[PDB]
Design an enzyme around this catalytic site. Structure first.
Site, PDB file in Angstrom:
ATOM      1  N   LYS A 233       0.847  -1.180   0.000  1.00 52.43           N
ATOM      2  CA  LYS A 233       0.000   0.000   0.000  1.00 52.43           C
ATOM      3  C   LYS A 233       0.896   1.247   0.000  1.00 52.43           C
ATOM      4  O   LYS A 233       1.323   1.736   1.052  1.00 52.43           O
ATOM      5  CB  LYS A 233      -0.979  -0.007   1.201  1.00 52.43           C
TER       6      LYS A 233
ATOM      7  N   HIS B 220       2.046   8.534  -0.601  1.00 50.44           N
ATOM      8  CA  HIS B 220       2.010   9.464  -1.726  1.00 50.44           C
ATOM      9  C   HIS B 220       3.339   9.586  -2.492  1.00 50.44           C
ATOM     10  O   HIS B 220       3.323   9.623  -3.722  1.00 50.44           O
ATOM     11  CB  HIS B 220       1.547  10.863  -1.276  1.00 50.44           C
TER      12      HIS B 220
ATOM     13  N   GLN C 146       5.864   7.363  -2.639  1.00 51.17           N
ATOM     14  CA  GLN C 146       6.017   6.068  -3.297  1.00 51.17           C
ATOM     15  C   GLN C 146       5.206   6.001  -4.590  1.00 51.17           C
ATOM     16  O   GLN C 146       5.701   5.607  -5.642  1.00 51.17           O
ATOM     17  CB  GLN C 146       5.594   4.947  -2.346  1.00 51.17           C
TER      18      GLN C 146
ATOM     19  N   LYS D 159      11.740   4.461   0.784  1.00 49.77           N
ATOM     20  CA  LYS D 159      12.605   4.264  -0.394  1.00 49.77           C
ATOM     21  C   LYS D 159      12.786   2.791  -0.758  1.00 49.77           C
ATOM     22  O   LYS D 159      12.715   2.419  -1.937  1.00 49.77           O
ATOM     23  CB  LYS D 159      14.003   4.874  -0.166  1.00 49.77           C
TER      24      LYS D 159
ATOM     25  N   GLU E 240      11.230  -0.077   0.193  1.00 54.75           N
ATOM     26  CA  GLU E 240      10.063  -0.837  -0.177  1.00 54.75           C
ATOM     27  C   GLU E 240       9.659  -0.474  -1.612  1.00 54.75           C
ATOM     28  O   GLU E 240       9.402  -1.358  -2.438  1.00 54.75           O
ATOM     29  CB  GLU E 240       8.932  -0.568   0.821  1.00 54.75           C
TER      30      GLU E 240
ATOM     31  N   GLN F 281      20.370 -17.783  -4.819  1.00 55.01           N
ATOM     32  CA  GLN F 281      21.736 -18.023  -4.386  1.00 55.01           C
ATOM     33  C   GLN F 281      22.086 -16.901  -3.414  1.00 55.01           C
ATOM     34  O   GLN F 281      22.570 -15.849  -3.836  1.00 55.01           O
ATOM     35  CB  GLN F 281      22.684 -18.048  -5.584  1.00 55.01           C
TER      36      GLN F 281
ATOM     37  N   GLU G  98      21.290   4.618  -1.606  1.00 52.85           N
ATOM     38  CA  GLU G  98      22.227   5.618  -1.060  1.00 52.85           C
ATOM     39  C   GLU G  98      23.214   6.116  -2.133  1.00 52.85           C
ATOM     40  O   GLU G  98      24.440   6.137  -1.948  1.00 52.85           O
ATOM     41  CB  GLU G  98      22.965   5.050   0.156  1.00 52.85           C
TER      42      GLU G  98
END
Length: 251
Positions: free
Chosen positions: A15, A18, A20, A41, A43, A97, A148
């Site tokens: 969910k 805004h 995102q 960020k 997710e 892996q 980052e």
């Protein structure tokens, strides 16, 4: 073409907030997000990767962070989501892996549990580390996530990532808390159409590139109820660290 839909988010259990959602709706080939801590960020980036692996069979992508330990965060979240989601796509099978940070989604010509199932394509996602340039040896990438990014040297982008993207005309999602006026600031500005804003020098008078779209949010833009808590931390957090990590300011 296609971006992940509300139906796809619902399958994921996702969910989006805004900021995102604005990132997911952008069709820009260079998306640049300057966001404070706890912005969502990780997710959001992970959902992007999941969507490519299933929606574009054979797609290849990397998540790159300054270290393998950082890269493991988004990688780990993509793994959970891909392994679960694969349940509702009977013609897929996931292979992991963990040590090599390599995730494979094998696509078949029929349900995997059916006799005679033939593998038609394999999507691939890897975690990569800027502090290990030696393992940055080519792949033909459809997509890339830089986590980052402002802490990753520009040379990693210009020499090891951008070339292998421009081939398949792949996309990049470039995410970071700001680290002053470096290449991440430049790429941010190329996509910034939100006008004059404190913390962002040359905002409001900057030019933009059509392939770029940029997003900005302080931690307290995403979490207004935490604003006072963030401000009250200034008592023991240096000003510059506060303005960057929470304000998402370019200083």
């Amino acid at each position: 073409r296609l971006r992940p839909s509300d139906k796809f988010f619902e399958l994921l259990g996702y969910k989006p907030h805004h900021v995102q959602l604005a990132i997911h709706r952008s069709t820009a080939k260079r998306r640049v997000a300057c966001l404070g801590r706890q912005s969502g960020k990780s997710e959001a980036a992970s959902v992007e990767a999941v969507f490519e692996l299933f929606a574009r069979p054979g797609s290849q992508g990397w998540i790159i962070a300054p270290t393998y330990d950082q890269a493991e965060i988004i990688f780990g979240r993509v793994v959970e989501k891909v392994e679960r989601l694969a349940e509702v796509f009977p013609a897929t099978e996931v292979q992991l892996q963990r040590r090599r940070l390599r995730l494979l989604v094998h696509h078949y010509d029929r349900p995997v549990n059916a006799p005679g199932a033939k593998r038609v394509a394999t999507s691939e996602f890897r975690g990569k580390s800027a502090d290990r340039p030696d393992n940055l040896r080519g792949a033909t990438l459809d997509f890339v996530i830089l986590d980052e990014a402002a802490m990753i040297p520009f040379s990693v982008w210009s020499e090891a990532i951008e070339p292998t993207l421009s081939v398949r005309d792949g996309w990049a999602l470039i995410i970071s808390t700001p680290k002053g006026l470096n290449w991440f600031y430049e790429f941010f500005l190329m996509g910034w159409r939100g006008g004059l804003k404190e913390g962002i020098p040359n905002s409001g008078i900057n030019q933009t590139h059509p392939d770029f779209e940029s997003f900005h949010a302080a931690s307290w833009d995403v979490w207004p109820e935490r604003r006072e808590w963030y401000m009250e931390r200034r008592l023991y957090i240096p000003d510059l660290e506060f303005r960057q990590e929470y304000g998402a300011e370019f200083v």
